[PDB]
Paper text:
An ortholog with 54% sequence identity from S. loihica (YP_001095227.1) is also of unknown function, with a molecular weight of 14 105 Da (residues 1–125) and a calculated isoelectric point of 4.9. Similarly, the structure of YP_001095227.1 consists of a protein dimer (residues 0–125 for chain A and residues 0–48 and 53–125 for chain B), two sodium ions, two chloride ions, nine 2-methyl-2,4-pentanediol molecules and 95 water molecules in the asymmetric unit. In the ‘open’ conformation (YP_001095227.1), these helices are 15 Å apart, leading to the creation of a deep nonpolar cavity. An analysis using the CastP server reveals a deep cavity (1743 Å3) lined by over 20 residues that are all hydrophobic, except for Asp73, which is hydrogen bonded to Tyr34. The floor of the cavity is formed by the β-sheet and helix α1. This large hydrophobic cavity represents a potential ligand-binding pocket that is occupied in the crystal structure by three 2-methyl-2,4-pentanediol (MPD) molecules, which are likely to stabilize the ‘open’ conformation by partially filling the cavity. Conversely, in the ‘open’ state, Trp71 is solvent-exposed and may participate in protein–membrane interactions, whereas His6 and His31 form stabilizing hydrogen bonds with Asp33 and Asp72, respectively. The dimerization mode of the ‘open’ structure, YP_001095227.1, is different and comparatively weaker. The presence of a deep cavity in YP_001095227.1 is similar to the eukaryotic Sec14-like proteins, which also adopt the same SpoIIAA-like fold. Calculations using the PPM method show that the ‘open’ conformation of YP_001095227.1 can associate with the lipid bilayer by immersing its exposed nonpolar residues from α2 and α3 into the lipid acyl-chain region.
The crystal structures of the proteins encoded by the YP_749275.1 and YP_001095227.1 genes from Shewanella frigidimarina and S. loihica, respectively, have been determined at 1.8 and 2.25 Å resolution, respectively. These proteins are members of a novel family of bacterial proteins that adopt the α/β SpoIIAA-like fold found in STAS and CRAL-TRIO domains.
Residue numbers in the entry:
A (entry chain A): 0 to 125
B (entry chain B): 0 to 48, 53 to 125
The structure:
Amino acid sequence: GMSSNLHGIAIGIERSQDDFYLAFKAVGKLTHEDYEQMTPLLESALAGIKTPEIVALIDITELDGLSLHAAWDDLKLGLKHGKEFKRVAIIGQGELQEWATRVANWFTPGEFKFFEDKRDALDWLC
Amino acid sequence: GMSSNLHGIAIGIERSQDDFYLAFKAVGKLTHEDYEQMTPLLESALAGIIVALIDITELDGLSLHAAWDDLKLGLKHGKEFKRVAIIGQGELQEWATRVANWFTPGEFKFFEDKRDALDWLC
Ligand SMILES: [Cl-]
Ligand SMILES: [Cl-]
Ligand code: NA
Ligand code: NA
């Protein structure tokens, strides 16, 4: 009964033309340890920001899900930093993920919008 | 970043002379999915079978959700285990075993060598 599944969150700051954006790529089944590894970089990225200025891209194309603890870490990060994001582009596949993006958008102050194409997402995002 | 750590639980019935025990090996950082893969096997074993052996030499720990599944399993089934040999290394794992022993109705004892453990286990 063993398993060696690939998972994690990649975080970076990317560029599209003359705009910088915060990029995430969530892969596999996320754990609390994954949120822990990513949190200091996120805190570094948002240092000094107290207004809705940030735009982010979150690629969930290879995301399987979140552990229970990870789901709580995620909500904690949203409660703590979410107001600082004005727009969030979600990149995934299918209508069920589109629907989940619309549900997230209802809950959040920043504008969340779903895409399948990165170039479309970046055009809207920045 | 990315990772692909090995984790899981091996379970099965084993022999020591003309005598049997339930063997567990806990590897890595255990998750809820690991507990769900393992539970139906544990139940079939208990319907068919008590003393057990738990190898923690390669155990890192349990996720929050898994610690809960684990406690749920101990509350349901631990009374059925009269003796539990914990196979591990070091005094921190021994201490953890002694703490577990205090909490539980069966006798839990720490060993470094499987052969020494099986002599006491059955
Ligand atoms: Cl977790
Ligand atoms: Cl879990
Ligand atoms: Na929103
Ligand atoms: Na005990």
